[PDB]
């Protein structure tokens, strides 16, 4: 009773819905912003698009809602729909690639002397620079800048919790990636009067090892038929034609591979590294098989009286066997041996190279997890 109807009344009599919990132009209302992440569902590492979900915990004080006996001293804590406070119509300078879901228009926790607690989980369409640099083992970092899209920091100050909180705090276990750390730094670019956005850093690490495995098999298994086509010559010289069949076959195979590679990066591309040199490794088996094909080509051919008849017989046979013996002199196997071992150098050299680069790529550019 103690002026309850009175209080109650006066409050709703004088209280202003559309007003800011501050008095004039000054230090403003110090709103607390801090989100405990739920998990993330889709990383479009290719366009640098980020759809995650977290809690929008906001909290500041409404010294305009401090109650009295019944709602203050009666029930120190009571729930009341928002819709009555300035809400950070927050957009993300890079990210905020789309609207809020479970972000605004939801109830809030209002304390006795005016404290306000609003904890809503939400899904948000963002876009961070995971750029086409989300695959190097050295990976990269990003700028996630949150802030309102009609308000300018003049009638409120934004403030954070931790900066180490981490993003693996609610990292998706469903992620083909991994994370090292999440930096959180408060910002106010001076290119705009409006103090604004906060930059949040993603020192992301995404190592999904699954198909590069059977990709290796081509390179090496194709090599099987490759070393084979380079081995088949002094193995079965008649490989002559069958050889060409091999490369038709070998080339179509690698071209189909050419088919799956562009359409697969089509959703998760970054630096060429792997492709850069396998591209070379490609060109390598490609041309090596084709010049060996020219190795194959280079051969212009390969690619008394009684006794007289006898004598005429003696000369017939012998005469042309030298001729076909000439073909021997012409297609001997010197090259095959020499370049099948130049094949030895080439393929085992260029092989242990990307082997190496790849080797160097996973270990060397790994520690910049920062």
């Amino acid at each position: 009773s103690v002026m309850e109807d009175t209080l109650l009344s006066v409050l709703f009599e004088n209280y202003n819905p559309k007003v800011r919990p501050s008095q004039t132009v000054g230090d403003k209302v110090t709103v607390r912003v801090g989100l405990t992440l739920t998990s993330l569902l889709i990383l479009n590492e290719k366009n640098e698009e980020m759809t995650t979900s977290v809690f929008l915990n906001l909290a500041w004080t409404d010294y305009r809602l401090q109650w009295d006996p019944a709602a203050y001293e009666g029930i120190k804590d009571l729930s009341i729909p928002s819709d009555d406070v300035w809400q950070p119509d927050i957009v993300l300078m890079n990210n905020n690639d789309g609207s809020f879901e479970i972000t605004l228009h939801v109830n809030v926790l209002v304390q006795h002397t005016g404290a306000v607690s609003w904890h809503p989980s939400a899904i948000y369409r963002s876009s961070c620079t995971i750029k086409v640099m989300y695959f190097p083992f050295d990976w990269q970092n990003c700028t996630m800048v949150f802030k309102s899209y009609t308000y300018d920091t003049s009638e409120v100050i934004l403030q954070h919790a931790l900066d180490a909180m981490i993003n693996q705090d609610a990292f998706t276990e469903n992620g083909q990636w991994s994370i090292e750390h999440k930096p959180s730094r408060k910002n106010w670019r001076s290119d705009d009067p409006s103090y604004e956005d906060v930059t949040f850093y993603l020192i992301i690490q995404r190592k999904p090892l699954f198909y590069i495995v059977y990709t290796i098999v081509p390179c090496i298994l194709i090599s099987i038929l490759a070393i084979l086509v380079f081995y088949l010559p002094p193995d079965a010289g008649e490989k002559m034609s069958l050889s060409i069949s091999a490369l038709l076959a070998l080339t179509v195979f690698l071209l189909l591979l050419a088919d799956k590679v562009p359409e697969t990066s089509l959703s998760v591309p970054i630096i060429i590294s792997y492709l850069m040199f396998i591209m070379i490794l490609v060109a390598f088996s490609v041309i090596l098989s084709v010049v060996v094909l020219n190795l194959h080509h280079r051969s212009p051919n390969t690619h008394e009286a009684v006794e007289a008849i006898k004598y005429i017989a003696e000369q017939l046979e012998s005469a042309s066997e030298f001729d076909d013996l000439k073909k021997d002199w012409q297609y001997v196997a010197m090259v095959a041996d020499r370049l099948f071992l130049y094949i030895f150098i080439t393929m085992c050299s260029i092989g242990t190279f990307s082997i190496f680069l790849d080797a160097s790529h996973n270990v060397p550019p790994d520690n910049p997890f920062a």
């Binding site: 132009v25 366009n47 957009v91 690639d97 876009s127 899209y149 009609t150 002559m240 034609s241 060409i244 069949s245 038709l248 080339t251 179509v252 071209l255 050419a258 088919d259 490609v286 084709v290 094909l293 020219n294 080509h297 280079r298 051969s299 212009p300 051919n301 390969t302 690619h303 009286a305 009684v306 007289a308 008849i309 005429i312 017939l316």
Partner: protein
Amino acid sequence: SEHETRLVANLLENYNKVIRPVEHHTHFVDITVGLQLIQLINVDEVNQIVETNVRLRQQWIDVRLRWNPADYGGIKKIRLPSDDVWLPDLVLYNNADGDFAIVHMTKLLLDYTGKIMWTPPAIFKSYCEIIVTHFPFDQQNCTMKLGIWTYDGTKVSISPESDRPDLSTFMESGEWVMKDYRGWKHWVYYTCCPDTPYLDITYHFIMQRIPLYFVVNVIIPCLLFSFLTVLVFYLPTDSGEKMTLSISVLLSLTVFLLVIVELIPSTSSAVPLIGKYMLFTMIFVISSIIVTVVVINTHHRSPSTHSAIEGVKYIAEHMKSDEESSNAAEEWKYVAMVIDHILLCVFMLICIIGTVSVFAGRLIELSQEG
């Protein structure tokens, strides 16, 4: 205090939001547009659709918003939310594919005098020419008109604000590149009606396309195929033993050319390139076609290639000799003298066609690169 409540309430009462600050029958409501694309998110030259960042600077005056010491004296310039304002139905003429995004419920600023600005952070859906003339090396100028939508120059007039580039905030992630962009004003009166119609801002986007990755993959299997067909020439004249062997290649390669066709027309369908680009491939690819068919039909062009005891000896020797003849006949079929002709016949052809393909390639690259 200072007429506190009397101040605020009076203002609400006699003021109709929907009213347009019409001032006598003349100048119309003078309202100016000023678009600053902060940045672009994505574009589809094929479907000529773009999602872009726009901060619309909208200006106009409402002499009804002028004040005295009890509104301007309170705090010079202040923040009043939109609603109460008459929002020009802005519209991109041949564009407009989408609603202005974040135009709604934003705020504006009123001066001690009245002058108001409405500059809400937009990003929207666009629709501009690309025609099959945008992907050219010689580009096309995206004609984009902007201006008042349902009001005439007698009720209202949209005017421009300034010059500024489109590559000022052009997307570096675009598969295209900018030349220049200009925008000049205009008033459109129609021979239809004797009346004076709306005003408009006309954008002109002059940019040339094609990211270079494409460039390399395609022309190299061509010089690739060039060498196999090059081999298609040299293989036969230096070795007609694997004519059919090459039969294989002819199959494996035009099919390679066939499947490359699925890939690049979808590219074609993925990105609108001026068809006159297509003829490059047309004759080029098709000569691979006319040349083969002749080269290999010719490759193919050849009939079959692609005392008494003493007398016994002479009836027998005579048998060996006319078959001797016969052998020479079929060889008199596959000569190695003109396969050399076709070699230089066409290689000059290829160095002609090729250098002719390089011709227009080089030529308008003498125009584009400029």
